[PDB]
Design a protein around this motif. Structure first.
Motif, PDB file in Angstrom:
ATOM      1  N   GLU A 193      -4.023  26.992  -7.771  1.00  0.00           N
ATOM      2  CA  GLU A 193      -2.983  26.499  -8.667  1.00  0.00           C
ATOM      3  C   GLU A 193      -3.391  26.429 -10.140  1.00  0.00           C
ATOM      4  OE1 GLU A 193      -1.177  22.570  -7.688  1.00  0.00           O
ATOM      5  OE2 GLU A 193       0.697  23.686  -7.898  1.00  0.00           O
ATOM      6  N   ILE A 194      -2.543  27.001 -10.989  1.00  0.00           N
ATOM      7  CA  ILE A 194      -2.792  27.023 -12.422  1.00  0.00           C
ATOM      8  C   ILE A 194      -2.131  25.829 -13.107  1.00  0.00           C
ATOM      9  CG2 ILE A 194      -0.750  28.246 -13.219  1.00  0.00           C
ATOM     10  CD1 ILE A 194      -2.655  29.873 -15.068  1.00  0.00           C
ATOM     11  N   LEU A 195      -2.545  25.573 -14.343  1.00  0.00           N
ATOM     12  CA  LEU A 195      -2.043  24.451 -15.120  1.00  0.00           C
ATOM     13  C   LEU A 195      -0.547  24.475 -15.412  1.00  0.00           C
ATOM     14  CD1 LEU A 195      -3.733  23.081 -18.374  1.00  0.00           C
ATOM     15  CD2 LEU A 195      -1.274  22.996 -17.910  1.00  0.00           C
ATOM     16  N   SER A 196       0.133  23.421 -14.980  1.00  0.00           N
ATOM     17  CA  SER A 196       1.561  23.253 -15.204  1.00  0.00           C
ATOM     18  C   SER A 196       1.630  21.932 -15.942  1.00  0.00           C
ATOM     19  CB  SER A 196       2.298  23.136 -13.872  1.00  0.00           C
ATOM     20  OG  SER A 196       1.983  24.226 -13.023  1.00  0.00           O
ATOM     21  N   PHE A 229      -7.504  22.857 -14.867  1.00  0.00           N
ATOM     22  CA  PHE A 229      -6.984  24.152 -15.267  1.00  0.00           C
ATOM     23  C   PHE A 229      -6.671  25.000 -14.051  1.00  0.00           C
ATOM     24  CE2 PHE A 229      -5.447  27.177 -17.763  1.00  0.00           C
ATOM     25  CZ  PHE A 229      -6.260  28.197 -18.237  1.00  0.00           C
ATOM     26  N   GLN A 230      -7.705  25.330 -13.290  1.00  0.00           N
ATOM     27  CA  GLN A 230      -7.502  26.121 -12.094  1.00  0.00           C
ATOM     28  C   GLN A 230      -7.795  25.263 -10.878  1.00  0.00           C
ATOM     29  OE1 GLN A 230     -10.321  29.076 -10.338  1.00  0.00           O
ATOM     30  NE2 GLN A 230      -8.840  30.621 -11.023  1.00  0.00           N
ATOM     31  N   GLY A 231      -6.768  25.057 -10.055  1.00  0.00           N
ATOM     32  CA  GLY A 231      -6.918  24.277  -8.841  1.00  0.00           C
ATOM     33  C   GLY A 231      -8.102  24.684  -7.969  1.00  0.00           C
ATOM     34  N   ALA A 254       0.816  -1.205   0.000  1.00  0.00           N
ATOM     35  CA  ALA A 254       0.000   0.000   0.000  1.00  0.00           C
ATOM     36  C   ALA A 254       0.843   1.245   0.000  1.00  0.00           C
ATOM     37  CB  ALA A 254      -0.895   0.006   1.215  1.00  0.00           C
ATOM     38  N   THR A 255       0.476   2.213  -0.822  1.00  0.00           N
ATOM     39  CA  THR A 255       1.228   3.457  -0.848  1.00  0.00           C
ATOM     40  C   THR A 255       0.342   4.701  -0.935  1.00  0.00           C
ATOM     41  OG1 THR A 255       2.447   4.823  -2.394  1.00  0.00           O
ATOM     42  CG2 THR A 255       1.674   2.644  -3.164  1.00  0.00           C
ATOM     43  N   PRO A 256       0.561   5.662  -0.023  1.00  0.00           N
ATOM     44  CA  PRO A 256      -0.159   6.932   0.096  1.00  0.00           C
ATOM     45  C   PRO A 256      -0.348   7.731  -1.172  1.00  0.00           C
ATOM     46  CG  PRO A 256       2.032   7.139   0.903  1.00  0.00           C
ATOM     47  CD  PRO A 256       1.741   5.674   0.846  1.00  0.00           C
ATOM     48  N   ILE A 257      -1.550   8.277  -1.305  1.00  0.00           N
ATOM     49  CA  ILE A 257      -1.945   9.088  -2.444  1.00  0.00           C
ATOM     50  C   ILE A 257      -2.010  10.525  -1.956  1.00  0.00           C
ATOM     51  CG2 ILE A 257      -3.731   9.486  -4.161  1.00  0.00           C
ATOM     52  CD1 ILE A 257      -4.664   6.630  -3.773  1.00  0.00           C
ATOM     53  N   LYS A 258      -1.091  11.370  -2.411  1.00  0.00           N
ATOM     54  CA  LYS A 258      -1.086  12.764  -1.968  1.00  0.00           C
ATOM     55  C   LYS A 258      -1.873  13.649  -2.923  1.00  0.00           C
ATOM     56  CE  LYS A 258       3.364  13.684  -4.312  1.00  0.00           C
ATOM     57  NZ  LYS A 258       2.753  14.486  -5.413  1.00  0.00           N
ATOM     58  N   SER A 259      -2.485  14.715  -2.416  1.00  0.00           N
ATOM     59  CA  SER A 259      -3.217  15.620  -3.300  1.00  0.00           C
ATOM     60  C   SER A 259      -2.150  16.252  -4.191  1.00  0.00           C
ATOM     61  CB  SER A 259      -3.940  16.708  -2.502  1.00  0.00           C
ATOM     62  OG  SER A 259      -4.655  17.579  -3.364  1.00  0.00           O
ATOM     63  N   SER A 260      -2.536  16.867  -5.303  1.00  0.00           N
ATOM     64  CA  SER A 260      -1.534  17.466  -6.182  1.00  0.00           C
ATOM     65  C   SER A 260      -1.630  18.988  -6.249  1.00  0.00           C
ATOM     66  CB  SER A 260      -1.652  16.873  -7.594  1.00  0.00           C
ATOM     67  OG  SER A 260      -1.261  15.507  -7.625  1.00  0.00           O
ATOM     68  N   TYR A 261      -2.118  19.600  -5.175  1.00  0.00           N
ATOM     69  CA  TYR A 261      -2.276  21.046  -5.143  1.00  0.00           C
ATOM     70  C   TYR A 261      -1.564  21.711  -3.978  1.00  0.00           C
ATOM     71  CZ  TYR A 261      -5.891  19.729  -8.447  1.00  0.00           C
ATOM     72  OH  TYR A 261      -6.528  19.159  -9.530  1.00  0.00           O
ATOM     73  N   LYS A 262      -0.472  22.402  -4.284  1.00  0.00           N
ATOM     74  CA  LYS A 262       0.292  23.101  -3.263  1.00  0.00           C
ATOM     75  C   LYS A 262      -0.321  24.467  -2.964  1.00  0.00           C
ATOM     76  CE  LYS A 262       2.782  19.554  -4.164  1.00  0.00           C
ATOM     77  NZ  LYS A 262       2.297  18.454  -5.042  1.00  0.00           N
TER      78      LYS A 262
END
Lengths: 317, 318
Positions: free
Chosen positions: A128-131, A242-244, A116-124
């Motif tokens: 957040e805008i599209l990268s 697009f926009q977090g 099992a491995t942790p799923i982190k959110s992807s928004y710092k």
């Protein structure tokens, strides 16, 4: 990233061995699980999904599940204040492997190895805008709008485990203030549907993620149409956020708070949506220059016999 | 050596037939152009379009069976079992129409390779060996079928989609129903120890046409370790006693059953099977000492230590 594993006996179901990391990932004490049933740590809402996996399994895929952190025990905990029992998202990888004999009973004795491995959110940062580093995920719902497939890549962007969304009407996730700009969108995925494989993008729309915020989705729509029943089978949207969101923690709890007005919402929309489904049911059409070749093989084959008829007659009697 | 079959090609645009091998006349009885320009789907028994279309919506960017229509000649309607082989291929630009040049769309072409399927039974009531086929069937705990090896269709005129959905009960001889229940018992008591399996007393099974056969089954099952109930029963068959009339997928609807206190008394039996399992929880007693000995065992430890570690590695960082 930073995972942990466990070996479960498939006889009775209890964990047997654990990697050291069990502790640093879920806070559990090293040998805490040994002897306990693995399900006990699987959120009651994901047990169905989990069974589904080790049943159609007894490339190697992965699925998602909520696991409960360590906070509750025999004595609970003395000193530091209580413990709000929580669960966290994990990607799991099954792996069955035969258990080694130990001495010297027909029936192979199996062994489940879960990693099992942790799923982190992807928004710092908040909005957040599209990268180009941002994940690309797809979702698919049927003619009636019920969603049916969700790329694992969607969990870290919407904080929904695939099984949370699948089965729900795609609609419920549209900003009630946008139902309109949307209806006119589907009205296009359909027109486009007059060409198998035809694709196209659209103007960022608002999608209701897990934690209550809404986001801006960059979508490249596509769909499949039964070429025999000439009906739309399913619509699938390739996505990129697009926009977090407002609250960077996609998995954060969603705060209750909204508004409306019965006569102009509980129906204005509950009706406008209804027109969207109906408008998806609208039998597309696929012209083909081989239709003439048909209706023409008719008249030609009918006459070619109509003649035979006179012949079989003008010659017989 | 089954080189007797025919292909054709379809436009996924409208499902119309764009070409068709010359054999089509041979095997199925239609002239070289009878189909061209036709909705290929009309030539497959209603009760199969499902299976078909489904095999489409999934395999679109393995084989399957359906019932096809023979040419209505003249000197009703006839259908014969076929094994299709869908193959999607794109058309090269120099061959794509102008309605597919103007869009991002794609011009998919279906290459359906039909092949007739003859029965493996030639001599009535045949009891061979090396020439007989081995095929498995698997039904859920409430007793209804969930999967059937394709290798079965040629041994029971049942196309797979003809079995999935129905309760494996039905195909048992009304007279053996009792002895069946006696075995499902064994299946269950055998489920205590995972992996277990066991051959059995050849039994009667209803094939397509209406005849019964003798099945050499080696039953096996899966018990969910956690919610200690049975998940599914799978049976690997080997048919050692052929059918009376060598089924060529016909039919003979002239049965003979009995009254309430003889039939309704056969239903209290089947519903009794669905019981002896479905919920009947399977025992999985974990020995107390072993668990510890095996816990001390420094070999097992390191074994696990690696196992774990090799999975922590592959499935994770790849």
């Amino acid at each position: 990233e930073d995972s942990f594993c466990c070996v479960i006996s498939m006889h009775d179901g209890i964990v047997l061995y654990t990697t050291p990391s069990i502790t640093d990932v879920l806070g559990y004490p090293r040998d805490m699980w040994l002897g306990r049933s693995f399900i006990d740590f699987v959120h009651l809402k994901d047990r169905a999904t989990f069974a589904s996996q080790i049943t159609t399994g007894i490339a190697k895929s992965t699925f998602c599940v909520m696991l409960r952190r360590y906070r509750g025990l025999k004595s609970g905990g003395f000193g530091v204040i209580g413990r709000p029992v929580s669960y966290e998202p994990f990607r799991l990888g099954l792996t069955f492997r035969e258990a080694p004999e130990e001495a010297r009973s027909n029936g192979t004795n199996m062994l489940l190895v879960i990693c099992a491995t942790p799923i982190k959110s992807s928004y710092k940062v908040p909005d957040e805008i599209l990268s180009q580093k941002s994940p690309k995920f797809a979702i698919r719902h049927t003619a009636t709008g019920i969603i049916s497939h969700v790329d694992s890549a969607a969990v870290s962007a919407l904080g929904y485990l695939p099984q949370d969304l699948i089965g729900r009407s795609i609609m419920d996730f549209y900003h009630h203030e946008d139902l309109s700009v949307m209806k006119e969108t589907y009205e296009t995925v359909m027109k486009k549907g007059q060409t198998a494989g035809a694709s196209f993008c659209s103007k960022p729309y608002r999608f209701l993620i897990q934690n209550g915020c809404y986001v801006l989705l960059e979508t490249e729509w596509t769909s499949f149409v039964n070429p025999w029943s000439r009906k739309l089978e399913f619509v699938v949207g390739h996505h990129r956020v697009f926009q977090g969101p407002k609250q960077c923690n996609v998995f954060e709890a969603a705060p209750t708070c909204k508004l409306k007005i019965s006569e102009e919402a509980q129906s204005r929309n509950t009706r406008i949506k209804e027109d969207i489904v109906k408008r998806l049911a609208e039998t597309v059409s696929r012209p083909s220059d081989t239709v003439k070749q048909e209706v023409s093989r008719r008249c030609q084959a009918l006459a070619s016999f109509m003649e035979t008829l006179m012949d079989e007659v003008s010659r017989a009697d």
